[PDB]
């Protein structure tokens, strides 16, 4: 079923490689793992379009778990401070990064231990994996659509356990906002290379989900939306909304990092801005894109690993 | 003709943007300029397959212009030494001095009966080093280099050019490039990422394969052996491919199969160099010459690379 791991009677183990080559990425297209992924992505998109107008200063859900997953992001956020980067050329993966991940791989299992109540700890090895793989590559010193995909996966797992009763778009907004805060900070500090990047022939170097989320938020208002897709092209306005909206937050981040005229370096986002008249279109289109440009492409999905609990490699 | 320029009767003017969109990238495909590019592409490629084993501490060709141009590369190398970092903001600064001093340096490089040629040359070379303002390098800049050495060829500045010179020249050029990328922290200009051949270069690897192509099975390495870090290291002064793959090897951090899946694929798949070369050319015409993100910024004059039909 696409939505609730059959807790109790369903067993967990360490997830493992399954995507290997071209066919293996395709069999994956029909797996139970994927139908869960696509499902939770739909939900969080649908939800988030309730939150056009999030609380930029929000701090906690009313759901216990969004508050734990909040606080654990918090702990691995404190980790960057404890891991000053290495001097030298701002050009590739900065080496300090291996270290941070060593520290992570050390207290994560502890921090999820505390986070889930007793009865659940037998879920950690599976959970560990996904959260753990959310923040970039352990040894390539990169980060891209594949890990962002892993974080959504973490949450969908926690969700699949039924620990987000009545989760409003504001809870999705809140967890991802911390998530992107952290990933924005990691990419810049560890000076990380893109993974699965399709160059100038892709949406964005590291993200895709941000945009499917941002776009969703203004979906329901399109004409009465504080900005039009045309307008994200205006550095000043994007700034104005970069707290309330993921799409501005995305675009703001490209804009900060990348040096030329926007149209030359982010040609797809440019075309979108200039070609899709309204946000509901962008989101429909950016979802269609996701399921081609991430879910079906190997450089991007091969490090999705499957357990037996949350995201099984069984058929349909 | 693909080969010469009507000197002195074709006229020369500051190049000027011509590729604008999908449409005009497809016209460009029938420009004199493109055939003049394809023509010298082949030339250097077959010449260099003559030179599997070049003198890695050669300094000077026996041709007048290849030392002159060597010397110009050298004059701007030096410019770097006097422009330290904090892409990297010290760099517009370097480009600024390149155009203050470069028309001048090509002044010395040619016979006084030639000065009419600079604005055009000036443009092509002075753009072989990545964008003034975008702070990137990519294969359109590499294609610019070739373009320049082709302008020179087209004024017949290079009689019975040998493989060994098409090395030497290029070998110097990349030496600077590896430097500019690291010292300036230049991003990849116009790239496919993982779905492309190299973040930054395509020609290194055509030349690279040419060289070993004639001897393929008796080549010091075979194409699968680029995947061994130390064998690659042995050859990197003497063979462009290894130099290419060496560069990747010292800059990109994970497994090679993972970060340069395309070069991997080649190496695990294409049995002999001549075929690797054959592929990379076919692929240079799709992936570089027919891709607008990549050629947009190749501007056209009236004299060397003119924007006209056939």
């Amino acid at each position: 079923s696409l939505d609730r791991v059959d807790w109790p009677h369903a067993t967990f183990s360490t997830p493992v490689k399954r995507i290997f080559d071209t066919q293996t990425t395709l069999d994956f297209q029909s797996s139970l793992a994927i139908h869960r992924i696509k499902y939770h992505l739909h939900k969080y998109t649908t939800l988030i379009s309730h939150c056009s107008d999030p609380d930029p200063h929000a701090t906690a859900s009313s759901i216990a778990m969004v508050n734990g997953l909040m606080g654990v992001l918090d702990k691995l956020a404190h980790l960057i401070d404890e891991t000053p980067p290495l001097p030298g050329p701002r050009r590739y993966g900065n080496l300090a990064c291996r270290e941070w991940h060593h520290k992570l791989d050390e207290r994560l299992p502890q921090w999820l231990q505390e986070m889930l109540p007793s009865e659940y700890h037998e879920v950690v090895p599976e959970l560990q994996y996904y959260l753990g793989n959310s923040f970039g590559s352990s040894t390539r010193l990169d980060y891209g659509t594949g890990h962002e995909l892993s974080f959504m996966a973490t949450v969908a797992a926690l969700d699949m356990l039924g620990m987000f009763p009545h989760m409003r778009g504001a809870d999705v907004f809140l967890l991802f906002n911390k998530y992107y805060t952290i990933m924005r900070r990691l990419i810049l500090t560890y000076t990380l290379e893109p993974a699965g990047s399709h160059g100038v022939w892709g949406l964005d170097d590291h993200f895709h989900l941000v945009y499917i989320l941002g776009s969703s938020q203004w979906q329901l208002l399109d004409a009465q939306a504080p900005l039009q897709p045309r307008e994200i092209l205006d550095k000043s306005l994007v700034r104005e909304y970069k707290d309330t909206n993921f799409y501005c937050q995305g675009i703001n981040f490209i804009n900060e990092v990348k040096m030329g005229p926007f149209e030359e370096h982010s040609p797809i986002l440019y075309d979108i801005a200039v070609t899709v008249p309204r946000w509901s279109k962008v989101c429909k289109g950016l979802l269609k894109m996701y399921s081609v440009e991430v879910l079906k492409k190997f450089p991007v999905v091969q490090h999705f690993w499957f357990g037996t609990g949350f995201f099984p490699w069984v058929n349909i | 003709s693909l080969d010469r320029v009507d000197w002195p009767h074709a006229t020369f003017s500051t190049p000027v943007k011509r590729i604008f969109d999908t449409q005009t990238t497809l016209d460009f495909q029938s420009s004199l300029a493109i055939h003049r590019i394809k023509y010298h592409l082949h030339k250097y490629t077959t010449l260099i397959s003559h030179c599997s084993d070049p003198d890695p501490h050669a300094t000077a060709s026996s041709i007048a212009m290849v030392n002159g141009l060597m010397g110009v590369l050298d004059k701007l190398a030096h410019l770097i030494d006097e422009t330290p970092p904090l892409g990297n903001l010290a760099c517009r600064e370097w480009h600024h001095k390149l155009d203050e001093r470069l028309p001048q340096w090509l002044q010395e490089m040619l016979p006084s009966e030639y000065h009419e040629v600079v604005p055009e040359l000036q443009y092509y070379l002075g753009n072989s080093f990545g964008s003034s303002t975008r702070l990137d390098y990519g294969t359109g800049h590499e294609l610019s280099f070739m373009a320049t050495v082709a302008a020179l060829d087209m004024l017949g500045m290079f009689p019975h050019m040998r493989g060994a010179d098409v090395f030497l020249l290029f070998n110097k050029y990349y030496t600077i490039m590896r430097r500019l990328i690291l010292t300036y922290t230049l991003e990849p200009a116009g790239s496919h990422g993982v779905w492309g051949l190299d973040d930054h270069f395509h020609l290194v690897y055509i030349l690279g394969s040419s060289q070993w192509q004639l001897l393929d099975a008796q080549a010091p390495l075979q194409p699968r052996e680029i995947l061994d870090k130390s064998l690659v290291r042995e050859y990197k002064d003497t063979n462009f491919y290894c130099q290419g793959i060496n560069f990747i090897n010292e800059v990109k951090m994970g497994p090679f199969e993972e970060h340069s899946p395309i070069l991997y694929d080649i190496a695990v798949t294409v049995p002999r160099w001549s075929k690797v070369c054959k592929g990379l050319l076919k692929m240079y015409s799709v992936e570089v010459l027919k891709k607008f993100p990549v050629v947009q910024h190749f501007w056209f004059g009236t004299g060397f690379f003119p924007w006209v039909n056939i």
Binding site: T22, T25, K297, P299 | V194, W195, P261, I262, D265
Partner: peptide, 4 residues
């Protein structure tokens, strides 16, 4: 699916 994978570059070649």
């Amino acid at each position: 699916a994978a570059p070649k």
